[PDB]
Amino acid sequence: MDLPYYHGRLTKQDCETLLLKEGVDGNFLLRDSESIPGVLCLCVSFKNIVYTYRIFREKHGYYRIQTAEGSPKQVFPSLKELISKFEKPNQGMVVHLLKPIKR
């Protein structure tokens, strides 16, 4: 795609290596789901563990994510708006996004 930190078909394994090797929280990227066509995954590092969230297209061209049980599904007009929200602290994600890992 367009976004510099979208990696397309990137294995879960390579994803983990790229996200965790620096040893810092908040490294993140987007990749394709390995199993569900048309689904994206936002993957981010926290305390040496990768946390993965699937992002669905409604489609309607919007992007849907649910970060936790009892958090409402949230829909965004664009991936950039989704990423921008979770760059802020304490927004219901395990960790906030800091450094985009570029392709």
Side-chain angles (χ1 to χ4, degrees):
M1 295 188 332
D2 320 84
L3 289 172
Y5 48 86
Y6 167 72
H7 291 238
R9 273 167 297 111
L10 177 75
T11 66
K12 287 175 172 176
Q13 178 189 30
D14 287 339
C15 180
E16 174 163 306
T17 300
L18 294 179
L19 290 179
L20 293 189
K21 61 179 189 170
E22 187 170 1
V24 59
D25 296 339
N27 283 4
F28 73 94
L29 60 80
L30 292 169
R31 65 172 173 82
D32 297 339
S33 172
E34 286 191 344
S35 56
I36 321 184
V39 172
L40 298 162
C41 301
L42 170 64
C43 308
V44 60
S45 62
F46 180 67
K47 304 303 186 222
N48 309 124
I49 298 177
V50 175
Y51 291 86
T52 301
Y53 303 89
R54 285 171 178 167
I55 296 169
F56 298 91
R57 295 152 16 184
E58 301 249 279
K59 59 177 185 297
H60 170 281
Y62 277 26
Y63 299 91
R64 181 180 78 245
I65 187 174
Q66 186 180 350
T67 54
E69 195 179 48
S71 180
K73 296 174 178 178
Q74 193 164 4
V75 185
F76 300 85
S78 66
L79 287 169
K80 297 204 19 186
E81 291 196 8
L82 186 157
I83 296 303
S84 195
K85 165 126 182 310
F86 291 108
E87 287 180 334
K88 310 182 297 185
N90 292 335
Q91 302 294 308
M93 196 160 274
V94 171
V95 57
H96 77 276
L97 310 181
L98 182 51
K99 181 182 173 187
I101 301 309
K102 297 171 57 196
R103 192 172 190 171

PDB file of all heavy atoms in Angstrom, residues 24-62:
ATOM      1  N   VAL A  24      12.297  -1.936  22.908  1.00  0.00           N
ATOM      2  CA  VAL A  24      11.586  -0.741  23.362  1.00  0.00           C
ATOM      3  C   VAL A  24      10.073  -0.937  23.184  1.00  0.00           C
ATOM      4  O   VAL A  24       9.634  -1.630  22.260  1.00  0.00           O
ATOM      5  CB  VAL A  24      12.060   0.525  22.581  1.00  0.00           C
ATOM      6  CG1 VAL A  24      11.825   0.370  21.099  1.00  0.00           C
ATOM      7  CG2 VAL A  24      11.375   1.793  23.066  1.00  0.00           C
ATOM      8  N   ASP A  25       9.281  -0.356  24.079  1.00  0.00           N
ATOM      9  CA  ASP A  25       7.818  -0.424  23.946  1.00  0.00           C
ATOM     10  C   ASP A  25       7.322   0.473  22.835  1.00  0.00           C
ATOM     11  O   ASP A  25       7.900   1.525  22.583  1.00  0.00           O
ATOM     12  CB  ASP A  25       7.130  -0.008  25.242  1.00  0.00           C
ATOM     13  CG  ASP A  25       7.431  -0.938  26.389  1.00  0.00           C
ATOM     14  OD1 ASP A  25       7.828  -2.104  26.145  1.00  0.00           O
ATOM     15  OD2 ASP A  25       7.251  -0.503  27.548  1.00  0.00           O
ATOM     16  N   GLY A  26       6.222   0.081  22.196  1.00  0.00           N
ATOM     17  CA  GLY A  26       5.540   0.979  21.277  1.00  0.00           C
ATOM     18  C   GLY A  26       6.003   0.948  19.831  1.00  0.00           C
ATOM     19  O   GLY A  26       5.554   1.757  19.032  1.00  0.00           O
ATOM     20  N   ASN A  27       6.922   0.052  19.490  1.00  0.00           N
ATOM     21  CA  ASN A  27       7.234  -0.177  18.079  1.00  0.00           C
ATOM     22  C   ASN A  27       6.040  -0.845  17.434  1.00  0.00           C
ATOM     23  O   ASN A  27       5.482  -1.773  18.009  1.00  0.00           O
ATOM     24  CB  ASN A  27       8.473  -1.066  17.909  1.00  0.00           C
ATOM     25  CG  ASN A  27       9.763  -0.322  18.147  1.00  0.00           C
ATOM     26  OD1 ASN A  27       9.762   0.857  18.512  1.00  0.00           O
ATOM     27  ND2 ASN A  27      10.883  -1.020  17.964  1.00  0.00           N
ATOM     28  N   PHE A  28       5.645  -0.405  16.243  1.00  0.00           N
ATOM     29  CA  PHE A  28       4.442  -0.972  15.645  1.00  0.00           C
ATOM     30  C   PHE A  28       4.499  -1.060  14.132  1.00  0.00           C
ATOM     31  O   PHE A  28       5.247  -0.330  13.476  1.00  0.00           O
ATOM     32  CB  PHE A  28       3.196  -0.172  16.070  1.00  0.00           C
ATOM     33  CG  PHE A  28       3.081   1.177  15.421  1.00  0.00           C
ATOM     34  CD1 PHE A  28       2.339   1.335  14.261  1.00  0.00           C
ATOM     35  CD2 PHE A  28       3.698   2.285  15.975  1.00  0.00           C
ATOM     36  CE1 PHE A  28       2.229   2.584  13.659  1.00  0.00           C
ATOM     37  CE2 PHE A  28       3.596   3.532  15.373  1.00  0.00           C
ATOM     38  CZ  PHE A  28       2.856   3.676  14.220  1.00  0.00           C
ATOM     39  N   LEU A  29       3.691  -1.961  13.586  1.00  0.00           N
ATOM     40  CA  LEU A  29       3.505  -2.012  12.139  1.00  0.00           C
ATOM     41  C   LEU A  29       2.127  -2.533  11.777  1.00  0.00           C
ATOM     42  O   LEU A  29       1.407  -3.050  12.635  1.00  0.00           O
ATOM     43  CB  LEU A  29       4.585  -2.889  11.491  1.00  0.00           C
ATOM     44  CG  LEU A  29       4.713  -4.362  11.889  1.00  0.00           C
ATOM     45  CD1 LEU A  29       3.683  -5.262  11.194  1.00  0.00           C
ATOM     46  CD2 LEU A  29       6.125  -4.859  11.582  1.00  0.00           C
ATOM     47  N   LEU A  30       1.760  -2.356  10.503  1.00  0.00           N
ATOM     48  CA  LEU A  30       0.591  -3.001   9.922  1.00  0.00           C
ATOM     49  C   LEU A  30       1.033  -4.106   8.976  1.00  0.00           C
ATOM     50  O   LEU A  30       2.015  -3.949   8.270  1.00  0.00           O
ATOM     51  CB  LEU A  30      -0.274  -2.008   9.147  1.00  0.00           C
ATOM     52  CG  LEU A  30      -1.003  -0.948   9.971  1.00  0.00           C
ATOM     53  CD1 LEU A  30      -1.609   0.124   9.043  1.00  0.00           C
ATOM     54  CD2 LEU A  30      -2.085  -1.597  10.811  1.00  0.00           C
ATOM     55  N   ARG A  31       0.315  -5.218   8.987  1.00  0.00           N
ATOM     56  CA  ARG A  31       0.567  -6.299   8.037  1.00  0.00           C
ATOM     57  C   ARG A  31      -0.737  -6.974   7.634  1.00  0.00           C
ATOM     58  O   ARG A  31      -1.785  -6.753   8.241  1.00  0.00           O
ATOM     59  CB  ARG A  31       1.537  -7.321   8.636  1.00  0.00           C
ATOM     60  CG  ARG A  31       0.977  -8.037   9.841  1.00  0.00           C
ATOM     61  CD  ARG A  31       1.870  -9.191  10.311  1.00  0.00           C
ATOM     62  NE  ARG A  31       1.361  -9.737  11.568  1.00  0.00           N
ATOM     63  CZ  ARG A  31       0.373 -10.619  11.665  1.00  0.00           C
ATOM     64  NH1 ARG A  31      -0.219 -11.099  10.572  1.00  0.00           N
ATOM     65  NH2 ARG A  31      -0.025 -11.029  12.861  1.00  0.00           N
ATOM     66  N   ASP A  32      -0.698  -7.793   6.590  1.00  0.00           N
ATOM     67  CA  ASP A  32      -1.873  -8.578   6.238  1.00  0.00           C
ATOM     68  C   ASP A  32      -2.077  -9.683   7.252  1.00  0.00           C
ATOM     69  O   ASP A  32      -1.104 -10.207   7.788  1.00  0.00           O
ATOM     70  CB  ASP A  32      -1.732  -9.209   4.847  1.00  0.00           C
ATOM     71  CG  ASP A  32      -1.621  -8.180   3.737  1.00  0.00           C
ATOM     72  OD1 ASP A  32      -2.036  -7.022   3.932  1.00  0.00           O
ATOM     73  OD2 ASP A  32      -1.132  -8.546   2.648  1.00  0.00           O
ATOM     74  N   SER A  33      -3.329 -10.046   7.510  1.00  0.00           N
ATOM     75  CA  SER A  33      -3.622 -11.262   8.258  1.00  0.00           C
ATOM     76  C   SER A  33      -3.091 -12.471   7.495  1.00  0.00           C
ATOM     77  O   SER A  33      -3.112 -12.493   6.259  1.00  0.00           O
ATOM     78  CB  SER A  33      -5.124 -11.418   8.514  1.00  0.00           C
ATOM     79  OG  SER A  33      -5.407 -12.695   9.080  1.00  0.00           O
ATOM     80  N   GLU A  34      -2.596 -13.464   8.227  1.00  0.00           N
ATOM     81  CA  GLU A  34      -2.076 -14.667   7.591  1.00  0.00           C
ATOM     82  C   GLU A  34      -3.221 -15.556   7.116  1.00  0.00           C
ATOM     83  O   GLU A  34      -3.064 -16.306   6.151  1.00  0.00           O
ATOM     84  CB  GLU A  34      -1.172 -15.451   8.548  1.00  0.00           C
ATOM     85  CG  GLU A  34       0.207 -14.830   8.785  1.00  0.00           C
ATOM     86  CD  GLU A  34       1.153 -15.779   9.515  1.00  0.00           C
ATOM     87  OE1 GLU A  34       0.658 -16.774  10.096  1.00  0.00           O
ATOM     88  OE2 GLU A  34       2.386 -15.539   9.504  1.00  0.00           O
ATOM     89  N   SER A  35      -4.374 -15.472   7.778  1.00  0.00           N
ATOM     90  CA  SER A  35      -5.462 -16.397   7.464  1.00  0.00           C
ATOM     91  C   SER A  35      -6.715 -15.755   6.854  1.00  0.00           C
ATOM     92  O   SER A  35      -7.324 -16.350   5.966  1.00  0.00           O
ATOM     93  CB  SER A  35      -5.854 -17.196   8.713  1.00  0.00           C
ATOM     94  OG  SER A  35      -6.206 -16.361   9.803  1.00  0.00           O
ATOM     95  N   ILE A  36      -7.105 -14.565   7.306  1.00  0.00           N
ATOM     96  CA  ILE A  36      -8.333 -13.954   6.793  1.00  0.00           C
ATOM     97  C   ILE A  36      -8.074 -12.912   5.698  1.00  0.00           C
ATOM     98  O   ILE A  36      -7.514 -11.847   5.955  1.00  0.00           O
ATOM     99  CB  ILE A  36      -9.151 -13.282   7.915  1.00  0.00           C
ATOM    100  CG1 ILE A  36      -9.111 -14.108   9.197  1.00  0.00           C
ATOM    101  CG2 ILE A  36     -10.589 -13.069   7.475  1.00  0.00           C
ATOM    102  CD1 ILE A  36      -9.991 -13.531  10.291  1.00  0.00           C
ATOM    103  N   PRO A  37      -8.506 -13.210   4.462  1.00  0.00           N
ATOM    104  CA  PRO A  37      -8.372 -12.263   3.346  1.00  0.00           C
ATOM    105  C   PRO A  37      -8.991 -10.896   3.640  1.00  0.00           C
ATOM    106  O   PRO A  37     -10.109 -10.820   4.144  1.00  0.00           O
ATOM    107  CB  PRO A  37      -9.131 -12.958   2.205  1.00  0.00           C
ATOM    108  CG  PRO A  37      -9.077 -14.411   2.551  1.00  0.00           C
ATOM    109  CD  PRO A  37      -9.131 -14.478   4.049  1.00  0.00           C
ATOM    110  N   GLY A  38      -8.260  -9.831   3.337  1.00  0.00           N
ATOM    111  CA  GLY A  38      -8.792  -8.483   3.451  1.00  0.00           C
ATOM    112  C   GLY A  38      -8.709  -7.900   4.848  1.00  0.00           C
ATOM    113  O   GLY A  38      -9.107  -6.761   5.081  1.00  0.00           O
ATOM    114  N   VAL A  39      -8.188  -8.685   5.782  1.00  0.00           N
ATOM    115  CA  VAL A  39      -8.039  -8.229   7.160  1.00  0.00           C
ATOM    116  C   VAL A  39      -6.607  -7.741   7.394  1.00  0.00           C
ATOM    117  O   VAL A  39      -5.661  -8.325   6.880  1.00  0.00           O
ATOM    118  CB  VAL A  39      -8.386  -9.352   8.165  1.00  0.00           C
ATOM    119  CG1 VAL A  39      -8.050  -8.925   9.585  1.00  0.00           C
ATOM    120  CG2 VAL A  39      -9.865  -9.707   8.093  1.00  0.00           C
ATOM    121  N   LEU A  40      -6.459  -6.656   8.150  1.00  0.00           N
ATOM    122  CA  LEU A  40      -5.146  -6.154   8.530  1.00  0.00           C
ATOM    123  C   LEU A  40      -4.872  -6.461   9.991  1.00  0.00           C
ATOM    124  O   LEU A  40      -5.798  -6.675  10.771  1.00  0.00           O
ATOM    125  CB  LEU A  40      -5.052  -4.650   8.294  1.00  0.00           C
ATOM    126  CG  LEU A  40      -5.228  -4.218   6.842  1.00  0.00           C
ATOM    127  CD1 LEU A  40      -5.551  -2.738   6.815  1.00  0.00           C
ATOM    128  CD2 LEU A  40      -3.971  -4.509   6.044  1.00  0.00           C
ATOM    129  N   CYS A  41      -3.594  -6.469  10.352  1.00  0.00           N
ATOM    130  CA  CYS A  41      -3.209  -6.613  11.752  1.00  0.00           C
ATOM    131  C   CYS A  41      -2.306  -5.477  12.186  1.00  0.00           C
ATOM    132  O   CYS A  41      -1.305  -5.172  11.540  1.00  0.00           O
ATOM    133  CB  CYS A  41      -2.508  -7.949  11.982  1.00  0.00           C
ATOM    134  SG  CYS A  41      -3.529  -9.364  11.550  1.00  0.00           S
ATOM    135  N   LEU A  42      -2.680  -4.844  13.293  1.00  0.00           N
ATOM    136  CA  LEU A  42      -1.835  -3.859  13.949  1.00  0.00           C
ATOM    137  C   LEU A  42      -1.102  -4.598  15.048  1.00  0.00           C
ATOM    138  O   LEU A  42      -1.722  -5.213  15.905  1.00  0.00           O
ATOM    139  CB  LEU A  42      -2.660  -2.700  14.515  1.00  0.00           C
ATOM    140  CG  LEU A  42      -1.935  -1.711  15.431  1.00  0.00           C
ATOM    141  CD1 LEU A  42      -0.844  -0.943  14.711  1.00  0.00           C
ATOM    142  CD2 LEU A  42      -2.970  -0.752  16.053  1.00  0.00           C
ATOM    143  N   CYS A  43       0.218  -4.555  14.992  1.00  0.00           N
ATOM    144  CA  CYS A  43       1.043  -5.319  15.912  1.00  0.00           C
ATOM    145  C   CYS A  43       1.987  -4.362  16.598  1.00  0.00           C
ATOM    146  O   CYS A  43       2.582  -3.507  15.946  1.00  0.00           O
ATOM    147  CB  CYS A  43       1.809  -6.406  15.156  1.00  0.00           C
ATOM    148  SG  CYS A  43       0.738  -7.427  14.117  1.00  0.00           S
ATOM    149  N   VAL A  44       2.110  -4.482  17.919  1.00  0.00           N
ATOM    150  CA  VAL A  44       2.850  -3.501  18.697  1.00  0.00           C
ATOM    151  C   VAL A  44       3.567  -4.170  19.879  1.00  0.00           C
ATOM    152  O   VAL A  44       3.096  -5.170  20.431  1.00  0.00           O
ATOM    153  CB  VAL A  44       1.908  -2.367  19.190  1.00  0.00           C
ATOM    154  CG1 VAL A  44       0.799  -2.933  20.057  1.00  0.00           C
ATOM    155  CG2 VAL A  44       2.712  -1.258  19.894  1.00  0.00           C
ATOM    156  N   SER A  45       4.727  -3.635  20.243  1.00  0.00           N
ATOM    157  CA  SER A  45       5.553  -4.241  21.291  1.00  0.00           C
ATOM    158  C   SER A  45       5.250  -3.643  22.663  1.00  0.00           C
ATOM    159  O   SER A  45       5.063  -2.424  22.791  1.00  0.00           O
ATOM    160  CB  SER A  45       7.047  -4.063  20.964  1.00  0.00           C
ATOM    161  OG  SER A  45       7.427  -2.684  20.900  1.00  0.00           O
ATOM    162  N   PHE A  46       5.219  -4.503  23.681  1.00  0.00           N
ATOM    163  CA  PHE A  46       5.106  -4.051  25.070  1.00  0.00           C
ATOM    164  C   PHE A  46       5.755  -5.066  25.992  1.00  0.00           C
ATOM    165  O   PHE A  46       5.365  -6.231  26.003  1.00  0.00           O
ATOM    166  CB  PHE A  46       3.646  -3.834  25.471  1.00  0.00           C
ATOM    167  CG  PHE A  46       3.481  -3.366  26.897  1.00  0.00           C
ATOM    168  CD1 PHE A  46       3.929  -2.116  27.275  1.00  0.00           C
ATOM    169  CD2 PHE A  46       2.886  -4.183  27.846  1.00  0.00           C
ATOM    170  CE1 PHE A  46       3.786  -1.689  28.598  1.00  0.00           C
ATOM    171  CE2 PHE A  46       2.739  -3.756  29.171  1.00  0.00           C
ATOM    172  CZ  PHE A  46       3.189  -2.507  29.528  1.00  0.00           C
ATOM    173  N   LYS A  47       6.744  -4.619  26.761  1.00  0.00           N
ATOM    174  CA  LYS A  47       7.470  -5.488  27.677  1.00  0.00           C
ATOM    175  C   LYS A  47       7.870  -6.818  27.036  1.00  0.00           C
ATOM    176  O   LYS A  47       7.626  -7.881  27.597  1.00  0.00           O
ATOM    177  CB  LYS A  47       6.636  -5.726  28.938  1.00  0.00           C
ATOM    178  CG  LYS A  47       6.218  -4.435  29.630  1.00  0.00           C
ATOM    179  CD  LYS A  47       7.419  -3.572  30.003  1.00  0.00           C
ATOM    180  CE  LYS A  47       7.000  -2.353  30.813  1.00  0.00           C
ATOM    181  NZ  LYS A  47       7.707  -1.121  30.396  1.00  0.00           N
ATOM    182  N   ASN A  48       8.486  -6.729  25.852  1.00  0.00           N
ATOM    183  CA  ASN A  48       9.073  -7.869  25.144  1.00  0.00           C
ATOM    184  C   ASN A  48       8.062  -8.855  24.580  1.00  0.00           C
ATOM    185  O   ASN A  48       8.412  -9.986  24.236  1.00  0.00           O
ATOM    186  CB  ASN A  48      10.051  -8.614  26.062  1.00  0.00           C
ATOM    187  CG  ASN A  48      11.060  -7.686  26.701  1.00  0.00           C
ATOM    188  OD1 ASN A  48      11.192  -7.627  27.934  1.00  0.00           O
ATOM    189  ND2 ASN A  48      11.776  -6.949  25.871  1.00  0.00           N
ATOM    190  N   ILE A  49       6.816  -8.411  24.442  1.00  0.00           N
ATOM    191  CA  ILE A  49       5.761  -9.242  23.871  1.00  0.00           C
ATOM    192  C   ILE A  49       5.064  -8.457  22.770  1.00  0.00           C
ATOM    193  O   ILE A  49       4.852  -7.248  22.907  1.00  0.00           O
ATOM    194  CB  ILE A  49       4.745  -9.676  24.953  1.00  0.00           C
ATOM    195  CG1 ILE A  49       5.439 -10.526  26.015  1.00  0.00           C
ATOM    196  CG2 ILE A  49       3.550 -10.450  24.343  1.00  0.00           C
ATOM    197  CD1 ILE A  49       4.521 -10.919  27.143  1.00  0.00           C
ATOM    198  N   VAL A  50       4.715  -9.136  21.676  1.00  0.00           N
ATOM    199  CA  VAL A  50       3.920  -8.514  20.616  1.00  0.00           C
ATOM    200  C   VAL A  50       2.442  -8.686  20.904  1.00  0.00           C
ATOM    201  O   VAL A  50       2.016  -9.794  21.224  1.00  0.00           O
ATOM    202  CB  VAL A  50       4.221  -9.126  19.233  1.00  0.00           C
ATOM    203  CG1 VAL A  50       3.276  -8.532  18.160  1.00  0.00           C
ATOM    204  CG2 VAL A  50       5.670  -8.903  18.862  1.00  0.00           C
ATOM    205  N   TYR A  51       1.686  -7.587  20.820  1.00  0.00           N
ATOM    206  CA  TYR A  51       0.224  -7.609  20.960  1.00  0.00           C
ATOM    207  C   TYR A  51      -0.378  -7.319  19.585  1.00  0.00           C
ATOM    208  O   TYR A  51       0.051  -6.395  18.902  1.00  0.00           O
ATOM    209  CB  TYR A  51      -0.241  -6.602  22.020  1.00  0.00           C
ATOM    210  CG  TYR A  51       0.205  -7.077  23.368  1.00  0.00           C
ATOM    211  CD1 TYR A  51       1.477  -6.759  23.847  1.00  0.00           C
ATOM    212  CD2 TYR A  51      -0.586  -7.939  24.109  1.00  0.00           C
ATOM    213  CE1 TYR A  51       1.926  -7.257  25.058  1.00  0.00           C
ATOM    214  CE2 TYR A  51      -0.148  -8.441  25.324  1.00  0.00           C
ATOM    215  CZ  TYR A  51       1.105  -8.090  25.792  1.00  0.00           C
ATOM    216  OH  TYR A  51       1.568  -8.581  27.001  1.00  0.00           O
ATOM    217  N   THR A  52      -1.319  -8.163  19.180  1.00  0.00           N
ATOM    218  CA  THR A  52      -1.887  -8.115  17.837  1.00  0.00           C
ATOM    219  C   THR A  52      -3.378  -7.798  17.890  1.00  0.00           C
ATOM    220  O   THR A  52      -4.092  -8.343  18.708  1.00  0.00           O
ATOM    221  CB  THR A  52      -1.670  -9.438  17.097  1.00  0.00           C
ATOM    222  OG1 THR A  52      -0.258  -9.699  17.029  1.00  0.00           O
ATOM    223  CG2 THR A  52      -2.199  -9.341  15.674  1.00  0.00           C
ATOM    224  N   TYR A  53      -3.805  -6.867  17.046  1.00  0.00           N
ATOM    225  CA  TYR A  53      -5.208  -6.516  16.899  1.00  0.00           C
ATOM    226  C   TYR A  53      -5.599  -6.616  15.436  1.00  0.00           C
ATOM    227  O   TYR A  53      -4.963  -6.007  14.582  1.00  0.00           O
ATOM    228  CB  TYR A  53      -5.458  -5.092  17.405  1.00  0.00           C
ATOM    229  CG  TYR A  53      -5.042  -4.872  18.837  1.00  0.00           C
ATOM    230  CD1 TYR A  53      -3.749  -4.461  19.160  1.00  0.00           C
ATOM    231  CD2 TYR A  53      -5.940  -5.099  19.875  1.00  0.00           C
ATOM    232  CE1 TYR A  53      -3.378  -4.267  20.480  1.00  0.00           C
ATOM    233  CE2 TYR A  53      -5.579  -4.906  21.191  1.00  0.00           C
ATOM    234  CZ  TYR A  53      -4.290  -4.489  21.484  1.00  0.00           C
ATOM    235  OH  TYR A  53      -3.937  -4.296  22.799  1.00  0.00           O
ATOM    236  N   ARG A  54      -6.645  -7.373  15.129  1.00  0.00           N
ATOM    237  CA  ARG A  54      -7.120  -7.403  13.750  1.00  0.00           C
ATOM    238  C   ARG A  54      -7.949  -6.159  13.451  1.00  0.00           C
ATOM    239  O   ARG A  54      -8.699  -5.670  14.305  1.00  0.00           O
ATOM    240  CB  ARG A  54      -7.925  -8.666  13.491  1.00  0.00           C
ATOM    241  CG  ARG A  54      -7.035  -9.892  13.350  1.00  0.00           C
ATOM    242  CD  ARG A  54      -7.865 -11.157  13.317  1.00  0.00           C
ATOM    243  NE  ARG A  54      -7.003 -12.321  13.134  1.00  0.00           N
ATOM    244  CZ  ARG A  54      -7.391 -13.581  13.302  1.00  0.00           C
ATOM    245  NH1 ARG A  54      -8.634 -13.863  13.680  1.00  0.00           N
ATOM    246  NH2 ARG A  54      -6.524 -14.562  13.106  1.00  0.00           N
ATOM    247  N   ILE A  55      -7.778  -5.646  12.236  1.00  0.00           N
ATOM    248  CA  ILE A  55      -8.532  -4.500  11.758  1.00  0.00           C
ATOM    249  C   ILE A  55      -9.364  -4.950  10.566  1.00  0.00           C
ATOM    250  O   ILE A  55      -8.822  -5.465   9.581  1.00  0.00           O
ATOM    251  CB  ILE A  55      -7.614  -3.357  11.343  1.00  0.00           C
ATOM    252  CG1 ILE A  55      -6.845  -2.827  12.560  1.00  0.00           C
ATOM    253  CG2 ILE A  55      -8.424  -2.244  10.639  1.00  0.00           C
ATOM    254  CD1 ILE A  55      -5.714  -1.867  12.206  1.00  0.00           C
ATOM    255  N   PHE A  56     -10.673  -4.763  10.674  1.00  0.00           N
ATOM    256  CA  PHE A  56     -11.596  -5.218   9.644  1.00  0.00           C
ATOM    257  C   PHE A  56     -12.094  -4.076   8.776  1.00  0.00           C
ATOM    258  O   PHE A  56     -12.241  -2.953   9.240  1.00  0.00           O
ATOM    259  CB  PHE A  56     -12.778  -5.929  10.290  1.00  0.00           C
ATOM    260  CG  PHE A  56     -12.384  -7.152  11.063  1.00  0.00           C
ATOM    261  CD1 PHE A  56     -12.083  -7.069  12.420  1.00  0.00           C
ATOM    262  CD2 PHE A  56     -12.293  -8.372  10.430  1.00  0.00           C
ATOM    263  CE1 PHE A  56     -11.714  -8.196  13.119  1.00  0.00           C
ATOM    264  CE2 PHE A  56     -11.919  -9.502  11.122  1.00  0.00           C
ATOM    265  CZ  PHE A  56     -11.635  -9.414  12.466  1.00  0.00           C
ATOM    266  N   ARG A  57     -12.336  -4.378   7.504  1.00  0.00           N
ATOM    267  CA  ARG A  57     -13.019  -3.465   6.598  1.00  0.00           C
ATOM    268  C   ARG A  57     -14.508  -3.776   6.633  1.00  0.00           C
ATOM    269  O   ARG A  57     -14.909  -4.910   6.403  1.00  0.00           O
ATOM    270  CB  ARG A  57     -12.481  -3.612   5.170  1.00  0.00           C
ATOM    271  CG  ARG A  57     -11.036  -3.217   4.977  1.00  0.00           C
ATOM    272  CD  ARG A  57     -10.419  -3.997   3.815  1.00  0.00           C
ATOM    273  NE  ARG A  57     -11.430  -4.619   2.956  1.00  0.00           N
ATOM    274  CZ  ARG A  57     -11.153  -5.408   1.920  1.00  0.00           C
ATOM    275  NH1 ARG A  57      -9.892  -5.668   1.593  1.00  0.00           N
ATOM    276  NH2 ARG A  57     -12.139  -5.933   1.203  1.00  0.00           N
ATOM    277  N   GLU A  58     -15.345  -2.777   6.883  1.00  0.00           N
ATOM    278  CA  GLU A  58     -16.788  -3.045   7.017  1.00  0.00           C
ATOM    279  C   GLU A  58     -17.574  -3.666   5.794  1.00  0.00           C
ATOM    280  O   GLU A  58     -18.619  -4.292   6.025  1.00  0.00           O
ATOM    281  CB  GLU A  58     -17.474  -1.754   7.464  1.00  0.00           C
ATOM    282  CG  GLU A  58     -16.946  -1.217   8.784  1.00  0.00           C
ATOM    283  CD  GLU A  58     -17.954  -1.325   9.907  1.00  0.00           C
ATOM    284  OE1 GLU A  58     -18.843  -0.452   9.978  1.00  0.00           O
ATOM    285  OE2 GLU A  58     -17.862  -2.273  10.718  1.00  0.00           O
ATOM    286  N   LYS A  59     -17.143  -3.519   4.527  1.00  0.00           N
ATOM    287  CA  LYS A  59     -16.054  -2.643   4.109  1.00  0.00           C
ATOM    288  C   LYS A  59     -16.509  -1.193   4.250  1.00  0.00           C
ATOM    289  O   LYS A  59     -16.145  -0.518   5.224  1.00  0.00           O
ATOM    290  CB  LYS A  59     -15.551  -2.979   2.684  1.00  0.00           C
ATOM    291  CG  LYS A  59     -16.560  -2.910   1.541  1.00  0.00           C
ATOM    292  CD  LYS A  59     -15.893  -3.193   0.219  1.00  0.00           C
ATOM    293  CE  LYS A  59     -16.870  -3.008  -0.935  1.00  0.00           C
ATOM    294  NZ  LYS A  59     -18.015  -3.963  -0.870  1.00  0.00           N
ATOM    295  N   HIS A  60     -17.296  -0.706   3.292  1.00  0.00           N
ATOM    296  CA  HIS A  60     -17.732   0.685   3.267  1.00  0.00           C
ATOM    297  C   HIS A  60     -16.471   1.583   3.246  1.00  0.00           C
ATOM    298  O   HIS A  60     -16.551   2.800   3.367  1.00  0.00           O
ATOM    299  CB  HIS A  60     -18.659   0.944   4.474  1.00  0.00           C
ATOM    300  CG  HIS A  60     -19.006   2.379   4.712  1.00  0.00           C
ATOM    301  ND1 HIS A  60     -18.144   3.261   5.343  1.00  0.00           N
ATOM    302  CD2 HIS A  60     -20.150   3.062   4.514  1.00  0.00           C
ATOM    303  CE1 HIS A  60     -18.724   4.440   5.448  1.00  0.00           C
ATOM    304  NE2 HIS A  60     -19.949   4.345   4.950  1.00  0.00           N
ATOM    305  N   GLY A  61     -15.309   0.952   3.057  1.00  0.00           N
ATOM    306  CA  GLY A  61     -14.013   1.598   3.118  1.00  0.00           C
ATOM    307  C   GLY A  61     -13.587   2.119   4.483  1.00  0.00           C
ATOM    308  O   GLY A  61     -12.664   2.927   4.558  1.00  0.00           O
ATOM    309  N   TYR A  62     -14.248   1.700   5.560  1.00  0.00           N
ATOM    310  CA  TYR A  62     -13.803   2.110   6.898  1.00  0.00           C
ATOM    311  C   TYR A  62     -13.049   0.989   7.596  1.00  0.00           C
ATOM    312  O   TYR A  62     -13.053  -0.150   7.133  1.00  0.00           O
ATOM    313  CB  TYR A  62     -14.973   2.557   7.778  1.00  0.00           C
ATOM    314  CG  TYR A  62     -15.402   3.989   7.556  1.00  0.00           C
ATOM    315  CD1 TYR A  62     -15.187   4.613   6.333  1.00  0.00           C
ATOM    316  CD2 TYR A  62     -15.993   4.729   8.575  1.00  0.00           C
ATOM    317  CE1 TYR A  62     -15.574   5.931   6.124  1.00  0.00           C
ATOM    318  CE2 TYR A  62     -16.383   6.041   8.372  1.00  0.00           C
ATOM    319  CZ  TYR A  62     -16.170   6.636   7.148  1.00  0.00           C
ATOM    320  OH  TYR A  62     -16.558   7.944   6.950  1.00  0.00           O
TER     321      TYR A  62
END
